[PDB]
């Protein structure tokens, strides 16, 4: 069942798989992050409160002086949104903070204070976020793009390469905290264990073991397994554990209890082990040569003499065995080393350990951390015990603690933010386990180890960065001087916080200009995931492995949309349904699968849970009960895709198209193209300029509605009801009764955005779509914006295409275009530019904006008023005066013979110089709006007075009008109320509205609601008065500007760039092209009915680029326009309602087994006619992306029209008038227009300006500069015999500062001579080398 806004153009659909989930609100990531960042949070989980409670209170260094936190509040913005765009300042808000300074009493450290103070402190301004996730910073609209970064937590990464030519593998565990220092461990090619801190010089990892207050005995106790020997008064016998003999060949016959278990020479078999276990063998005598291979464990000193027999980590020799034997050391501790299980890496590292105690280790790490300086006891001890144990300099994270405890297999998910001893213990144990073999490596590209941080978290970090600086400053100031009784403001400082947050939002690597040339462009630029920026990598140091797709991208990141060229795989976009977890991992939905029944409940699944489960496929047919109708399903369990059974399914995919982005989901027949052309299509879709009259998609996906509504361009009704008055500027809604709050008077007023500019100069503009007195509902569109059409995204226009080669004019990729396209004015786009003219303050004096300029007649001065600024609505062209500005000139130092000429004529040169702003060459348009700013002290001129008067009258009129309509609605509601309980039907309109709000009634809530409406009226008039005063003061007050400037005039142009050979037009499947010619109507190929085809593409582009999707799109478009043509001809003569009913129903029932039963028995002869009228240009068709519309459905849809099933119809020829044999494909393809306009590219330079230090021309076309004659061009010219051309290519035309003037005189004198000279930049090189002691000189 469809709303009234959907009974206008109800789109025909083809999707087979019934979706069970609504597409979520497409910006919720950006909005929800910044909602977390700034919100009154009555606990320190996330937000500003988290930073404050993590950095406050502040204590002076036992000075009994406490500064502590209370709360914070966000102020009202001084300038709202459109004022911030007009003026140019950040849409910010003050951050008023309540802080408390308290000083404790003497010998009362925990005792009460002797003084308090509570002052509301202002600490900078944070920018705010508009209701589309965009910030306004300096007049512009900037977006901060979310970052993808390596997670805080442990990583048991291997090396896994050759990397030495040893053919070995190195397992280098690594710990990364969210704020702190790294702690790397790695093995060497000689398999010894090392350590390094913050990528410094290597150290053997025993140093930190000792520095954790551990001696050698406990180290060998923790990191090895003891082997105990018992001197049984002889033979040095050893006890047994039967597992210890696995995979070994004992040199003797293992025998006990008079029973042979293992033979000599025989290995200890598995059944030997089982027999040893069953027979309960404890202790045997061993040959004495077995113990000689051991390494002793602990310190067995001489108990008599107090001397050492053997320390820890000593290999034993038989004489030393006798020495411990004669000392009576019956119990001897050793180690269970091995070649397979228990590697002696700690033992050998202790052998290469050059330390002996804690102090040696701390001295060593102090030297390694900082060279040069002498070691010190307290400095080294404080450095080490502060580095990895401070809440200050080491915050692991909450998410870091979670992931660390998970990857360590420890149960508890929450713990400290600093590293304890047990954490390093278990990290060492697991690294040793991995080197032994029990354990598995991790990887980087797996999306379970990469988070998503958005504007909330980055803003919070920048705020903390400001706060630590201000806290250090306070701790400085609180220490010195006095107690004082001073007020808690002068030790605090606004600028070292606002500076930090403004340097983040103003120029980071993430805050960029929002491409604002399409609703799709804004949407796909707000949901962008970037791997660059701070905390990440750079494109010059990014290996191919992070650029690649990964099996954990299925439904969390789009694999097919990515910018190509310099950075592929770094700026991956986000999927359609892909949410974000609580911690910040990416999450995607799945439908719960019971025993065999698909339950339509939804469970969100993270990146690491998706492996242990089994996930079904969305293309699995099921029959009305959730049972899979097959006996198998193509699931995916751990990377692979294996044909599992009906019973082993745990989760089913949600919708068929959750693998793509939003930008790539608007491509019909995506499942046919090669991924290269799909990438190029989805990247060219976000560059289409909005045309003059946005038409439709004839063959669209079906998800244009959500993109149009969820982007901020269209104006969506907030409460349903009747529309009361529709201008082209405003829309007034009267709300329904049930949706009306009891408090206020309910009408709505929307104010549309008529003809303003965008960051790419295109003309963002809205127009209404509803009419007067027509019901709407909650959520309909009321005003289409740029590229929208009745709430559906329409990025271009759809035109009749034919695939045939045509006389070379579409040779490689060119696109022949008929004159009907330009004649119907259907690819015409509107641009809007901004021109600024400052009036600076020179030392010779101030410039003026007077109308009077020298040396110009009346042709230029016809279009300036008396003040000297161009009129509103003046058809200016290139090179014409807009802002007449003169500048003072000192003397000019007049010269010979023109001195004599001045003596002849006497027309003295003025002391002023013309420097007025004129229109840049090549453009032409109408001036739509003039903006004038001025410094406060300067007296304003006439035109500024006109503008201020007009703005003030407009503001007063609009505010008065808003109050008028609001009171009209309020009194109408009062009139409706007063009928109930004491009706004044004719009595009410007798008296005026003066005392209607005070009349008595039955003493109900409406009696004490007439007073509510009366107080609403009084509040409305008072609010009107105060807001009018505020607005008047805001208009009339001066505008703060840059230092040393007087006034700025901003003039707005509106070009109407039509279409020309050179423009780039693209399809949707990434078939680009440049228009080569614009033929007349008659020359175009026309089919048998006389209708000329409109665009003649090239067929050779299909079977080599393989994007076969565009041909099926062409066929389906031909079917759609066929049905539209049939219904148009049916509506041409007035036939009947029921005839249209019959045909429309039949057209809406194709083909077999689709959803969307859309029967027309519930439409009532007005909607039917409106539907038919809105359909007559062609019935729109939907195609969900991977669900698709199969070929036979297209065949039968074409057969519904009279068009041939083959899709190809014979085209005659325009010129000869004869017939093309081999009939050719025609049909309706949706074709875009990218904003690579030719006139923005084409530029030339005869002799422009020249660069200052090196006499070369300037950059590209902004300063009228020449081309870059690269090194390879010089190689090419050397390859030919061309010598003189090269000589003039790098001497006369560029750098020989006398040669070029001589060349100009020679050229205009009609004598193409040249005079070489020597290049200027070479002479600069001579001076640079000679600036050193390098005497270099030319000589002959």
């Amino acid at each position: 069942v469809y709303s009234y806004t959907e009974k206008k153009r109800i789109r025909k659909d083809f999707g087979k798989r019934p979706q069970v989930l609504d597409v979520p609100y497409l910006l919720s990531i950006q909005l929800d992050s910044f909602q977390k960042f700034i919100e009154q949070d009555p606990e320190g989980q996330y937000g500003l409160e988290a930073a404050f409670r993590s950095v406050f209170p502040i204590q002076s260094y036992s000075g009994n002086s406490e500064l502590q936190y209370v709360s914070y509040r966000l102020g009202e913005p001084v300038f709202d949104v459109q004022e911030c765009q007009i003026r140019g300042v950040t849409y910010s808000a003050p951050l008023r903070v309540k802080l408390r300074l308290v000083i404790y009493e003497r010998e009362a450290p925990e005792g009460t204070v002797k003084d308090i103070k509570e002052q509301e402190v202002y600490m900078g301004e944070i920018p705010l976020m508009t209701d589309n996730g965009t910030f306004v910073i300096n007049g512009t609209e900037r977006v901060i793009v979310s970052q993808l970064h390596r997670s805080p937590g442990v990583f048991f990464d291997s090396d896994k390469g050759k990397t030495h030519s040893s053919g070995k593998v190195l397992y280098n565990a690594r710990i990364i905290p969210y704020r702190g220092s790294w702690l790397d461990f790695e093995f060497d090619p000689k398999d010894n264990l090392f350590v390094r801190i913050d990528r410094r010089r290597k150290l053997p990892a025993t140093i930190i073991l000792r520095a954790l207050n551990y001696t050698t005995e406990q180290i060998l106790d923790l990191f090895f397994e003891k082997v105990i020997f018992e001197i049984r008064d002889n033979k040095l016998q050893m006890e047994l554990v039967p597992e210890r003999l696995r995979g070994e060949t004992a040199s003797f016959d293992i025998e006990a209890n008079g029973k042979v278990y293992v033979e000599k020479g025989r290995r200890i078999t598995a059944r030997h082990i089982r027999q040893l276990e069953k027979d309960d063998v404890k202790l045997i005598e061993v040959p004495v040569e077995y113990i000689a291979g051991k390494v002793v464990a602990k310190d067995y000193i001489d108990e008599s003499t107090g001397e050492l027999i053997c320390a820890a980590n000593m290999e034993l020799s038989l004489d030393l065995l006798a020495k411990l034997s004669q000392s009576g050391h019956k119990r001897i501790e050793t180690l269970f080393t091995n070649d397979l299980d228990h590697g002696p890496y700690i033992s050998e590292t202790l052998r290469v350990d050059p330390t002996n105690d804690r102090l040696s280790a701390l001295v060593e790490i102090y030297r390694m951390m900082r060279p040069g300086e002498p070691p010190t006891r307290e400095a080294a001890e404080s450095l080490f015990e502060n580095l990895f144990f401070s809440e200050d300099r080491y915050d692991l994270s909450a998410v870091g603690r979670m992931k660390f405890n998970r990857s360590l297999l420890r149960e508890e998910i929450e713990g400290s933010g600093i590293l304890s001893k047990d954490d390093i213990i278990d990290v060492m144990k697991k690294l040793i386990d991995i080197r032994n073999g029990k354990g598995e490596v991790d990887d980087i590209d797996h999306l379970g180890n990469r988070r998503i941080r958005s504007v909330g978290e980055m803003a919070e970090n920048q705020f903390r960065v400001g706060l630590v600086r201000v806290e250090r400053a306070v701790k400085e100031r609180l220490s010195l001087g006095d107690l004082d009784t001073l007020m808690p403001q002068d030790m605090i400082n606004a600028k070292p916080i606002s500076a930090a947050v403004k340097e983040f939002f103003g120029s980071s690597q993430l805050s960029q200009f929002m491409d604002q040339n399409n609703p799709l462009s804004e949407i796909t630029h707000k949901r962008r995931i970037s791997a660059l920026g701070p905390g990440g990598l750079t494109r010059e140091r990014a290996g191919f492995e992070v650029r690649d797709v990964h099996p954990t991208h299925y439904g969390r990141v789009c694999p097919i949309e990515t910018p190509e060229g310099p950075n592929i795989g770094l700026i991956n976009s986000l999927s359609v349904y892909a949410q974000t977890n609580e911690y910040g991992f990416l999450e995607t939905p799945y439908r719960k699968v019971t025993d065999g029944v698909v339950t339509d409940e939804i469970h969100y699944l993270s990146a690491i849970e998706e492996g242990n489960y089994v996930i079904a496929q969305a293309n699995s047919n099921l029959d009305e009960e959730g049972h899979f109708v097959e006996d198998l399903v193509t699931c995916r369990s751990k990377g692979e895709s294996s044909l599992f059974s009906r019973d082993q399914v745990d989760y089913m995919d949600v919708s068929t198209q959750q693998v793509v982005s939003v930008g790539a989901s608007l491509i019909p027949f995506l499942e046919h193209d090669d991924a290269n052309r799909a990438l190029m299509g989805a990247n060219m879709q976000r560059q289409a300029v909005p045309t003059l009259r946005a038409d439709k998609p004839l063959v669209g996906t079906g998800m244009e509605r959500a993109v149009a509504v969820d982007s901020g361009v269209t104006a969506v009704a907030k409460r349903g009801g009747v529309v009361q008055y529709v201008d082209a500027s405003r829309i007034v809604i009267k709300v329904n009764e049930d949706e009306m709050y009891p408090g206020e008077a309910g009408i709505d007023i929307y104010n549309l955005t008529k003809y303003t500019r965008s960051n790419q100069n295109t003309c963002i503009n809205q127009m209404p779509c509803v009419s007067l007195g027509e019901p709407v509902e909650r959520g309909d569109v009321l005003a289409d914006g740029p590229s929208t059409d009745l709430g559906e995204l329409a990025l271009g226009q759809n035109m009749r295409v034919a695939f045939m080669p045509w006389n070379g004019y579409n040779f490689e990729d060119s696109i022949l275009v008929s004159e009907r396209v330009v004649q119907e004015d259907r690819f015409t786009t509107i641009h809007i530019q901004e021109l600024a003219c400052v009036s600076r303050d020179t030392k010779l004096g101030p410039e003026e904006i007077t109308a009077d300029i020298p040396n110009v007649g009346e042709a230029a001065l016809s279009k300036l008023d008396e003040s000297g600024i161009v009129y509103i609505g003046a058809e200016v062209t290139g090179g014409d005066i807009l802002v007449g500005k003169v500048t003072p000139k000192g003397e000019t130092q007049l010269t010979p013979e023109e001195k004599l000429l001045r003596a002849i004529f006497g027309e003295k040169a003025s002391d002023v110089k013309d420097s007025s702003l004129r229109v840049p060459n090549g453009v032409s348009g109408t001036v739509i709006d003039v903006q004038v700013f001025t410094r406060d002290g300067v007296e304003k001129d006439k035109r500024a007075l006109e503008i201020e008067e007009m703005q003030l009258k407009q503001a007063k009129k609009d505010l008065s009008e808003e109050l008028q309509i609001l009171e009209a609605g309020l009194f109408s509601r009062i009139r409706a109320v007063l009928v109930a309980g004491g009706v004044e039907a004719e009595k009410l309109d007798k008296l005026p509205r003066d005392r209607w709000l005070e009349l008595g009634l039955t003493d109900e809530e409406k009696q004490n609601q007439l007073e509510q409406l009366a107080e609403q009226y009084d509040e409305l008039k008072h609010e009107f008065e105060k807001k009018l005063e505020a607005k008047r003061r805001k208009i009339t007050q001066g505008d703060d500007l840059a230092p040393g400037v007087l006034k700025i005039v901003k003039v707005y142009l509106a070009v109407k760039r039509r279409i020309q050979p050179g423009d780039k037009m693209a399809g949707r499947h990434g078939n680009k092209g440049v228009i080569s010619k614009i033929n007349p109507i008659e020359d175009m190929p026309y089919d048998e009915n006389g209708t000329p085809v409109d665009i003649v593409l090239n067929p050779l582009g299909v079977p080599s680029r393989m994007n076969i999707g565009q041909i099926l799109e062409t066929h389906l478009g031909m079917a759609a326009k066929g049905i539209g043509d049939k219904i148009n001809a049916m509506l041409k003569q007035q036939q009947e309602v029921a005839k249209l009913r019959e045909f429309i129903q039949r057209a809406y029932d194709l083909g077999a087994d689709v959803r969307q039963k859309v029967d027309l028995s519930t439409f009532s002869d007005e909607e039917v006619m409106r539907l038919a009228e809105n359909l007559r240009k062609g019935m729109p068709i939907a195609t969900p992306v991977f669900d698709g519309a199969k070929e036979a459905e297209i065949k039968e849809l074409l057969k519904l029209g009279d068009l041939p099933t083959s899709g190809q119809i014979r085209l005659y020829d325009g010129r000869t008038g004869e017939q093309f044999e081999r009939p050719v494909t025609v049909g309706y393809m949706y074709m875009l227009k990218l904003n690579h306009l030719v006139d923005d590219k084409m530029h030339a330079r005869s002799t422009g300006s020249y660069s200052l230090v090196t006499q070369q021309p300037l950059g590209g076309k902004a300063q009228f500069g020449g081309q870059r004659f690269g090194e390879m061009e010089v190689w090419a010219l050397e390859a030919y015999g061309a010598a003189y051309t090269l000589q003039e290519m790098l001497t006369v035309k560029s750098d020989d500062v006398n040669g070029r003037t001589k060349m100009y005189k020679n050229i205009v004198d009609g004598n193409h001579q040249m005079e070489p000279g020597m290049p200027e930049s070479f002479n600069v090189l001579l001076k640079e080398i000679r600036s050193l002691g390098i005497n270099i000189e030319l000589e002959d």
Binding site: G808, E1288, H1312
Partner: protein, 551 residues
């Protein structure tokens, strides 16, 4: 330099010299005072850190500027790709230049390029000034400047005069080899885009999807004579890498010629007798006979068997109508058998090469232009579309897939019973899917290339087909037999990022469309290919730079 609005821009050397002079002055003042030796030794070390001025950032660490960035010393003004050598002394920015988008414009002769009138008006400004002053149409040069500013109607004839025999230079950004820069005469265009002749897009490696080229102007007499003698387009028709021509007709014209020279087995008017190629032209355009029908014609071929003298020979060859139409293009000295076949792409390249090696250069360049003209004409007259019925799926495909599935099921059961090894089952599966893919490709090609069945005056006959994709592939006009079977047969076995091969290949074609899993498998290969084609460019450029600096 004084920036506007009271801002000052300076180089960092002012700061460095300030530092050195300051420390030197301080040391002078200390030596006046007879300071302690620790103070003067510290000051001399500071004066040593001269080192920053000469080459900052070599010894120790680099002192930084107010923006906390390592500032630039003299050695950074010399060295690097931003120093004088690579960036300012070898490659300069040039006056008299411009750039724009490019378009095709097949009406051009190949020694001339199209050029917009406005770019001509800007580039040739001083020539126009001189010509106007010489003709006495402006008294001074100032009046001439204001006259060309007003674009008054007599300036265009002056532009036409000074544009007459004046070459320009055209160049695209990756100038790999010496054909990257060529000369052209201009023909003025009432547009805004450079029209560039279609035959040299192969040499420029240029396609018209928005690519831009830069123009340069030779000024002096020696430079224009160089541009006409060496760099002119009609003097570079052979590649310097090898003697093969570089004016091969590329994709559309070769398709037109391939369609023009074939033979339907029974078309309108077969077996008549024609009395010369002019009769073939008349019989075609009147429509009484088809373009391709086997017709006994009479033709005369001239051979230069004598000492550089042509000798006529005329006979009754047995050819088609389209070939006899094409024969009016070939010049005198070529034997007739050069146009008596299907005329693919290697064939036409060899035809051009033979014409060059036998006749000379001028007839070969005129022959090249006539070939492009007639190729475009009959390609457009073909009407060679591409439709969804032009991708035939061989009907044995699903049976082959079913049999291969049976084989892989048997090997799966064998490894389930442990009779075989994991690498064994891997290679068994990979070989049976390879065999099935090969067999389905054989089935598709044998159903596509030859299935056309027409009947000459009798029962039945089979011929090569006109199934437009088969023409676009067999003719050589931008279509490979390995990029079919991704439109009809299975798409082979894609590879995982590790470099291995997936056990279950993608068995779906772009006509039937892939499902979600197959598409997600196919995505990785495209992304890896894109990244490699992006990162091969830097290595190739570096290799070229090394080679041209060693030789």
């Amino acid at each position: 330099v004084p920036l506007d609005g009271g801002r000052f821009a300076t180089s960092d050397l002012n700061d460095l010299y300030r530092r050195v002079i300051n420390r030197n002055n301080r040391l002078k003042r200390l030596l006046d005072l007879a300071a302690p030796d620790i103070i003067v030794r510290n000051e001399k070390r500071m004066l040593q850190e001269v080192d920053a001025l000469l080459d900052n950032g070599r010894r120790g660490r680099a002192i930084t500027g107010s923006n906390k960035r390592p500032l630039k010393s003299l050695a950074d003004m010399i060295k690097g790709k931003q120093g004088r050598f690579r960036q300012n002394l070898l490659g300069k920015r040039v006056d008299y230049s411009g750039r724009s988008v490019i378009t095709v414009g097949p009406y051009l002769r190949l020694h001339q390029c199209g050029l917009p009138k406005k770019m001509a008006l800007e580039l040739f400004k001083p020539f126009i000034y001189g010509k106007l002053e010489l003709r006495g149409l402006a008294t001074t040069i100032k009046a001439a400047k204001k006259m060309v500013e007003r674009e008054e109607a007599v300036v265009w004839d002056i532009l036409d005069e000074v544009i007459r025999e004046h070459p320009v230079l055209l160049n695209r950004a990756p100038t790999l080899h010496r054909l990257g820069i060529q000369a052209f005469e201009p023909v003025l265009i009432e547009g805004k885009a450079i029209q560039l002749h279609p035959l040299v897009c192969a040499a420029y490696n240029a396609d018209f999807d928005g690519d831009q080229m830069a123009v340069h102007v030779p000024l002096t007499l020696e430079a224009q004579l160089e541009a006409r003698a060496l760099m002119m387009s009609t003097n570079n028709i052979l590649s310097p890498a090898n003697g093969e021509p570089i004016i091969v007709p590329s994709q559309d014209v070769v398709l037109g010629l391939y369609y023009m020279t074939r033979d339907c087995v029974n078309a309108k008017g077969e077996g008549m007798v024609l009395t010369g190629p002019k009769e073939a032209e008349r019989l075609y355009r009147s429509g009484l006979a088809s373009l391709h029908a086997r017709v006994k014609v009479r033709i005369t071929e001239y051979e230069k068997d004598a000492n550089g003298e042509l000798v006529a020979k005329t006979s009754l060859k047995d050819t088609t109508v389209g070939r006899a139409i094409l024969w009016m293009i070939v010049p005198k000295g070529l034997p007739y058998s050069i146009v008596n076949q299907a005329l693919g792409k290697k064939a036409i390249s060899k035809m051009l090469n033979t014409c060059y090696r036998i006749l000379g250069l001028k007839p070969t360049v005129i022959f090249a232009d006539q070939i492009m003209y007639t190729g475009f004409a009959y390609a457009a007259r073909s009407g060679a579309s591409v439709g969804i019925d032009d991708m035939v799926i061989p009907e044995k495909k699903h049976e082959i897939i079913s049999e291969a599935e049976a084989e892989v099921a048997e090997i799966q059961e064998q490894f389930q019973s442990g009779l075989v090894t994991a690498g064994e089952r891997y290679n068994k599966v990979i070989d049976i899917w390879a065999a099935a893919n090969d067999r389905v490709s054989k089935a598709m090609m044998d159903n596509l290339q030859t299935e056309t069945v027409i009947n000459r005056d009798g029962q039945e006959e089979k011929q090569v087909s006109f199934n437009s994709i088969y023409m676009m592939a067999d003719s050589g006009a931008r279509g490979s037999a390995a990029q079919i079977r991704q439109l009809a047969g299975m798409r082979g076995l894609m590879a995982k990022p590790d470099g291995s091969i997936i056990e279950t290949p993608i068995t779906a074609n772009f006509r039937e469309g892939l499902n979600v899993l197959q598409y997600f498998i196919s995505t990785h290969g495209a992304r890896k290919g894109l990244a490699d084609t992006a990162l091969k460019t830097a290595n190739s450029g570096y290799l070229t730079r090394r080679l041209v600096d060693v030789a």
